[PDB]
Amino acid sequence: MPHAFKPGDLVFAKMKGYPHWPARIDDIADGAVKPPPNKYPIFFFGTHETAFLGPKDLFPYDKSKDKYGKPNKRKGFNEGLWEIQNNPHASYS
């Protein structure tokens, strides 16, 4: 059975106005800004942006890749598909 989200989990993350996007739950570095209550720091592959999202917008990658893991015209998306498949746990700083 599923557990709660934890750092390192791979997802497609949904934001208003954008396709379900390859992403990971990030850790929060010591001394870094913490997310709001009940939100997770989501790092978006390809764009390398961070937003804070709750579980309703987080789809586990294994379950969802057949639906959401196809190329998209949007900036950064296809780079992000490579990242989540090929090196999802690397530093992209």
Residue number with CB closer to ligand A1A33 (2 or 14)? 14
82 binds ligand A1A33 (CB under 6 A): no
78 binds ligand A1A33 (CB under 6 A): no
Q: What is the DSSP letter of 28?
A: -
Options 1-9, 33-41, 47-55, 84-92: segment touching ligand A1A33 (CB under 6 A): 47-55
Q: 10 CB contacts (<8 Å, ≥6 apart)?
A: 22, 23, 24, 60, 61, 62, 84, 88
Question: Rounded to an integer, what distance in angstroms lies between the CA atom of residue 30 and that of residue 33?
Answer: 9
Question: Rounded to an integer, what distance in angstroms lies between the CA atom of residue 57 and that of residue 16?
Answer: 10
72 binds ligand A1A33 (CB under 6 A): no
Contact positions toward ligand A1A33, by CB under 6 A?
Answer: 15, 18, 21, 44, 47, 49-51
